[model samples]
Target: MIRIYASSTIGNYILPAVIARYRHDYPQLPIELSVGNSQDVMQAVLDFRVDIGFIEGPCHSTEIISEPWLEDELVVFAAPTSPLARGPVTLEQLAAAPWILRERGSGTREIVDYLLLSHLPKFEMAMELGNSEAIKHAVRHGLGISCLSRRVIEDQLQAGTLSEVAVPLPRLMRTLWRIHHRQKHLSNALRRFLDYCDP
Candidate 1:
């Protein structure tokens, strides 16, 4: 059996279709899929616990070989009733608002901290949730504003439970990657799976 690990965001939003297609095309191959935070997925790859891993953040370790597989947009969102839901928002305005954020080790958190936080003043943390669903729920209830991938919030946005906030900065974008240990030999099954992922 081939083992695959993926970050929660990609596992929740993107991997269902890919896995279904792979299963349909290769009915004979046995597969085991697990979902976790990006840090967990990367650790699984490094520890040889999984044959392939997918993550939404950039890989920093030279021991892992990573290839970009997809791109996703990250957007700031808030409850429709929140002040942030109105006209264009400035960085100062965002920094002053209470924010719902992902937990420390999440790929989503890594990107937001590196790209968004670095450019803005200190923001208040309303809560630090571990999953996207929790963050969405908190934001929907006006707990705090948050940044999340567009893919994960499509349903909420469509239903008018959440609204994207227009921040006066460049769009936050990130690339999803397929990762594996550099020293590991690629077997035929692994090669086939990698092809299935990227193609």
Candidate 2:
């Protein structure tokens, strides 16, 4: 059995499709998956709670081996009813709107905070929620605007429940990653799982 501590980006999105395919190829090697924020995933890897972690954003830790998986853009989202839904939005405009923020330890939260500091200095956060789903639900109910990865809101965007607001600065897209302890040996099952990764 392989114990993998993964981020929700993979646990919720990419891994399901890949896991279904991988299971067909290697059903004998069981997998245990734990899902959480990137900070928690990285902490789990450091604490030896799991063998591998999949997360978004860069890893600067000297104790971990990190690999890039795929890239996704971070964008602003508004419910159909929010006044910001009128059309394209500027960072200055976003500053005045209440924001639905990710939990404090999340990588998405880190990125968003960075953006707010650099771009929207006066912006205020309306509330902080745990995950993408919570942020989406809050936005859908008109709690406020949210900034999240494109993967997090794809279905809602397609379903017309959410709309994207454009920002003028350089685009913000982050690569999802795979991280594990540097000294840990990759098991055959883990190696097989790596083979399934694309991008």
Candidate 3:
């Protein structure tokens, strides 16, 4: 079995269809997956624990080769009852708003800081959780507002558990990357998987 590691968002939402199709087509080559935050996935790739890793942020290590996999966007959202649920919220207001965030070292957390928090005058995290679903549920329950990948919150938005909060900014877009160590030998199995990962 080829071992793979993916960050939470990809593992939970994006890769399921990819994995299903790949498995149906490549039954001879077994597969296994370990899911974690993007930082953990990057570390697993660097430590040689997995043959390939999927992450939502840039690979900073010189020893790793990263490829752009897909595009995603972060959206600010809150429970329907929240006051900021329907307004044109500003960066300053967003900064002071109670926030539920993904924990440190997550690729999501990294991008959130870069895209949203860095521009604000003040930033505070009301609660921190490692999993994206926890953040979504927390937001749904009115714990605080959070910005997450649209892919992660579609169900809640559709079901009316959460509502989008408009903000004045360009799209909070990000790239998802497929990464591996530069020096690792690409076996036939790994190569086959790469073909399956294609757009």
**Per-model CA lDDT versus the true structure:** 0.87, 0.81, 0.87
Ranking by TM-score: 1, 3, 2
RMSD of each: 1.6, 1.7, 1.7
TM-score of each: 0.92, 0.91, 0.92
Residue-level lDDT tens digits of model 3 in 56-91 = 876478989988888999999999998889789887
> Number of backbone collisions per candidate, in order?
0, 0, 0
Ordered from best to worst lDDT, the candidate numbers read: 1, 3, 2
Which portions of model 2 miss their true places by more than 4 Å? none
Ranked by lDDT, the better of candidates 2 and 3 is: 3
Give the 10-residue window scoring lowest on summed lDDT in candidate 3. Answer: 101-110
lDDT of 2 by residue, 107-170 (tens): 8777777755357858888998888888899999999998888888899999999987766667
lDDT of 1 by residue, 1-199 (tens): 8898999888877877877888899989978889988888988998999988899886567889988888889899999999899999998999998889987766788888887877779888889998899999999999999998899999999999999999988888888888889998778987886677775
